[model samples]
Target: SKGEKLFTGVVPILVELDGDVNGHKFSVSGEGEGDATYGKMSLKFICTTGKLPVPWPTLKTTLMQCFARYPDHMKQHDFFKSAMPEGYVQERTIFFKDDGNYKTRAEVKFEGDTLVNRIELKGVDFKEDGNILGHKLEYNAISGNANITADKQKNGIKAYFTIRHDVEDGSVLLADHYQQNTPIGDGPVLLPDNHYLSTQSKQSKDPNEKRDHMVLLEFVTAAGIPL
Candidate 1:
């Protein structure tokens, strides 16, 4: 049992991230909460401010085309369609003269009593090195798991979590094809269309750069409660 450990869940409280690289700042603001039974964990980040290589309209059109093929997967998710319904494919566009400043929303949901065992969390930690439109952004360390670890304290349990994220480097791209991994499938599920936005870290890497612009998430439950 040296390498294995028991994991549990707790009520959610707050989630925060500061993506500042090379004197420039990338900001994120959101709200997070979970259930006492550890059956539900939800996080909604309403805004993400960053730069992009392409114009807002081009980026939006590519994204719309990409998510249009995910009706099946979106229907299976408890929160994807239910939470936003008509706005399931949500996004925001703000750019002038292609300065790269843009904002977008991100939603995360996890539901299961035995999620500790159901979710795999191993061998997914490495640095991201790459570029976007010749702009290089690299993260030295990144966590590749959604697993949470909890320890009993005097008041309640202190939980530690590492949630996976899909962050853009310095721009967006239009792809010929793509394969997305969703909870509904056995292997990586394929989406449709000839043109789409590349949403994964590997999809948008620059050829000249060695490291990509990566991000890490820090989320936790409120202090002082029972385990």
Candidate 2:
């Protein structure tokens, strides 16, 4: 009548926890479903009561850490996911320390339960345990000009690599993933190009300004990028 909407005569906040524990209290039975994810994850926290009695073991330990992380995001969602070998093609290659034609490549596949990865010259695109650049992708070294991100407009971060030291010599020295705020040639026509890639570190006799880049990442298959 007043606010109009009502579900089964408003079950009195799960009804006073059966109030009267000295003889009949603290027992909130049945009905389950939960979600509390960045607030999907690294997260969850609930506390509500404009005014109402809440003490069924403090609402049963705050709904058990928010419905126990939705089965820990469904059995830890997908990171290692059984070492991802479901439909083949998990390749990689990254190399760069000093000068040898420089190198970079990556790829992965498993397209039924979904687990894709790519870095075809930086179109990015990854998904599995969801998150990168913005963080939460705990492995898979990026090395050299990183801006792949996560923490909002999701997806693009299912990784696997294995580029074991092939650095006979390397030097791509930043060659366009992108970034140009004018002054690379002249300026005045600058309105686009910041895909991200601007680096410098090569002048040290112990002047050591502290900037390091000695990179590689490999996890091959699918003929491994360009073989």
Candidate 3:
């Protein structure tokens, strides 16, 4: 049954795989329709720490829980966003466009009751930031017709995820994420002209408060996932 990937809600996740990270790391929260499209699964990531730390459909949200605590839920986005001289309570955004040379891609398959997602980062050279060499942040997620758990995620805007959500429905799919580091240099930080900040919640109020839920989505397939 593997001729070509059929038109499931996961398409949005594929179309978004154009070899780049088009995200706004921070922004003002103004909920437009979740980047819904017709061919692929629609994916959404609400910003929690660095305001809205993603690109493309710049999410101006009161969420930045996308601002994370190393997935261990110890600190918050500020731990990183604060890396800049900017105020932790202040909102900001940075753009990371796709290099187009990156052969990065992601896919999901329903192996009976087990859904497996895989990512190939092409081992894109991110050798130093003094990061541990060959550190692929692998994540595992398990879903029941009940609550589930998966590989915890990591921070560092190096990885890019593409999403597609058919405009016809609200299911979701995309690169859950692979590992990489946003290549940096001695360049000046930017402040865009159409910049914005949100009045919603700031950084993580507590470890239990997850802002990622603001854009909760599902990878609805013909297989009818358990999540």
Which candidate number maximizes TM-score?
1
All-Cα superposition RMSD per candidate? 18.7, 25.7, 21.1
**Global CA lDDT of candidate 1, please?**
0.25
The candidate with the higher lDDT, 2 or 3, is: 3
User: What TM-score, over all chains together, does every model reach?
Assistant: 0.23, 0.17, 0.20
Ranking by lDDT: 1, 3, 2
Give per-residue CA lDDT, model 2, range 1-227, as digits (tens): 11111111211111111222112212222221112221011111122222212211112111111111112213222221222322122222222122111122323333343233322221122222222112222222222222311111112222222222211133112222211111111212112111221112121112331221111111111111120
- Cα lDDT tens digits, model 1, 1-227, are 11011122343333333333323444434344433222233433322555533222222111211111122222222222122111122222323122232333322222332211011111111122323233342322221211111211211111122222222453433221111222221222122122211121122223553322222222212222122
- Which scores higher on TM-score, 2 or 3? 3
Model 3, range 1-227, lDDT digits (tens) per residue?
11121221222221111122222122222121111112112234333344322232222111121112121121121122222222112111222122111233333333232222222222232232211121222122212121111211322223223323121134332223222222122223221111111111112122463564233232211111221
Q: Rank the candidates by TM-score, best first.
A: 1, 3, 2
**CA error at residue 56 for candidate 2, angstroms:** 62
Number of clashing pairs per prediction, in order: 9, 19, 38
Worst 10 residues of 2 by lDDT: 1-10
lDDT of 3 at 88: 16
- Per lDDT, the best of the predicted structures is 1
Span of 10 residues, lowest total lDDT, candidate 3: 191-200
